[PDB]
Symmetry: D2
Subunit: 260 residues, 4 copies
């Protein structure tokens, strides 16, 4: 009934949509397609690709936030098994954001980006991303819910870390092994998000410069050094602290090795 592409003479090349189908109705799809910059307003043929990769990312992150909320509810009621599924789903959605920014790295021409950017508004930065800002916000109540669940069960993090190793002989329970799977899914999620940050950094080096082996400024006026420093901020620093803790407590090698 409608077309995103009205002035296209060739009718086989029209993007026909908004047919009022029940599939369309269920998804609020016409509403979501209405957010695309209208073809009559695009300033560069690469503009649509630019916008779509961000919208895909923001949809993935709002869903991450939704499932992390659910995981807080599960942990607060000691429903460990149900918490695991929320974290695994979140990791998968995170991996879509990684794919989406790597689309820019692999296919966004830097010269198109620079042309487009010379005309963008002044403080147009992903520091204002709602997916990113809310993922940072919610990470703290998420860690707290896990930490408190481990406490109620009378375990340490060193315990649940150790029980991932089949050869570890300490006594276990159903609850301790469930909290272990939770920790492992949480670590995979945080690893994925850290991966998003590194791939977005590699993208920036290919579009604006500043590859550290070799500074440019964001539209906010900020050196890329600031982006690069924030790129190593984790969702759950406590988990990475517990990893290093395991190295110090269980490694029996420190300050004894040398080159051969």
């Amino acid at each position: 009934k409608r077309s995103l592409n009205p002035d296209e003479p060739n009718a086989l090349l029209s993007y026909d949509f908004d047919r009022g189908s029940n599939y369309e109705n269920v998804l609020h799809l016409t509403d979501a397609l209405g957010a695309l910059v209208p073809e009559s307003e695009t300033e560069h043929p690469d503009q649509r690709f630019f916008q779509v990769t961000h919208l895909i990312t923001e949809y993935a992150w709002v869903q991450v936030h939704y499932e992390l909320r659910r995981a807080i509810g599960h942990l607060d009621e000691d429903r460990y098994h149900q918490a695991v599924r929320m974290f695994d789903r979140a990791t998968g959605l995170s991996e879509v954001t990684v794919q989406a920014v790597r689309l820019l790295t692999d296919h966004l021409p830097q010269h198109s980006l620079l042309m487009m950017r010379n005309a963008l508004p002044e403080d147009a930065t992903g520091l204002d991303s709602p997916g990113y800002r809310n993922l940072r916000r919610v990470a703290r109540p998420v860690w707290k819910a896990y930490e408190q669940a481990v406490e109620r069960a009378g375990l340490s993090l060193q315990d649940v870390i150790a029980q991932q190793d089949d050869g570890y002989d300490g006594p276990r329970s159903g609850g301790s092994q469930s909290l272990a799977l939770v920790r492992e899914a949480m670590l995979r999620l945080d690893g994925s998000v850290l991966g998003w940050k590194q791939h977005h950094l590699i993208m920036v080096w290919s579009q604006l410069g500043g590859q550290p082996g070799l500074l440019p400024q964001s539209l906010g006026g900020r050196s890329l050094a600031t982006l690069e420093a924030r790129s190593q901020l984790a969702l759950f620093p406590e988990l990475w602290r517990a990893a290093e803790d395991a190295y110090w407590l269980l490694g029996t090698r420190h300050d004894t090795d040398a080159p051969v």
Copy 2:
């Protein structure tokens, strides 16, 4: 000031704040896009949002596939082969996003959740009405046509274009022919990726509605149709002629 996507959640740290009027949000029409999500007050199942978001991600990727394919037609019609290559490769990357979106359902959507949601869904609520799918199928013919006519204007045979992908092939080469070969190769990758989508979507359906063939009446879609019709449409390519040319090469070159 910010708005909340979940404004009846008491704990502010659990609030999804957005619509802050930043230039990032303005340039992307992000607030409008987030407005497509079913309101939290109206969800009937906690997995409904996940359901919706995997579709919306897929449809954004497919409308972008369409946009880039139109560009590929424009290039091919003017013999801009290099520039056409990039459009096909970009489409393949977007298609791979759709594959991971539906595999998100395979890996994480509980069949039991799906069946409960499906019992309340409307009748003939089907992806046969997907704009992404229908318009992709629509545009695939003009796309094959633009590639075929560029090959014809070059006076090349498709068999020759296939052959010179092999470094060991000794026949005549030109910049034009090797360019059209890179276009060919990029086109086959795109179609193969789309055939991957169709199969992963089918594997999903097997895990959610049943009917895995290894088991040798079938379940039915929300429009009353057997899953065997889905399985048959699952092997239809975008560019049949490329798969015929591969078959022709085996017969001409196979000893």
Copy 3:
């Protein structure tokens, strides 16, 4: 002191040097693995090495899949549900590596190269003799049996375990039934990934030997039509999971003639 895979190479910067006796190399048995590559003096096509390596990578992932599935049997037999989960998830990740490796051929192996190489390959050189695939098919029943037995020892129904994946489900739950539910979900992900390998391998064959069904048939190096490949391609590792999926569709769906 050292070896080279291309020793005659003029430019020393193009030499692939290995076997330097490092501890890294010693721990991994790397020299022996590199020793399996077709020698450069013996290659008959510049794409031969790509062909070989994609298979060797696949076979390494599948023997690891086998090792971890054996561990999953041992866990399930002792009711170590959580530990079994990890084995299945790991096998799934290893399976996804095999998907990547065959899609490398789809995306980058020229059909014309394949045909030239295929014309010179021995008779009945076929992946029906893949040790990875044969031992995977061997172990698939022992693996399903271990899961089924554990479910029975717990006095649960497969339909119950499926229902427990849904947060909205009101039925009785226990720590053991939800654990067995995470195991079911992990073995389904593995089987869907192996079904994914089969479909991508099929798509690759269509682009290299022909026979895309949307369009008598080509033959493998053993003489068999591609019709038998397509049929074997829908065979799952754990048919009883897919059976349980359809069982639930009839059991829970309320619109089968609506």
Copy 4:
């Protein structure tokens, strides 16, 4: 035939191989499987998974090396289209190494790693990886071959970057656009290898510690994890990232003019 696990007494669980089929003959598969540490010698059940992920990686890297040599040959003879394919193939092979290291991040138990690492030889390090040492060594001749091909065509790197943009109106030839496609493929390859380095770093943070947000552990060679992080930012083709930054300075019209 023969079994990889002969002391397994249930024959349905034997991994049978060395059947002398032509499939195995062509592939040298029996020799390659013989590199696996024998089951009777493994000291931890996670040891095989550890070894196999390295072996997959080194197979992928030796194939990257082989195809980059071919790319040098193509470039020295101005066969641009042919070189593009070798770089694209290398990129796919690099992506296999990324998935292999991420298999350790997602599934290798830190506690098993530490147990295993406490018994490993001293200075057993991937600094002695042949895939890694040879890829670093060959990257210089690869870049020189591209650079010389660009010079011979009388082009600048700015020109081939600009020609990736459909809106750029400078004069083009078949050669210049072909050399652009080559550049774009080498950038994807180098970005993929930079991705491997970052995912390998994230893995190391989860196994030995040292995640930089928390602020050190030492390698089996006694070297601080800070040196690994420093080398993590070294590209194959630094000149490509230098030309990206060059484009920012030459073509961006915003520097030192924006602010929050």
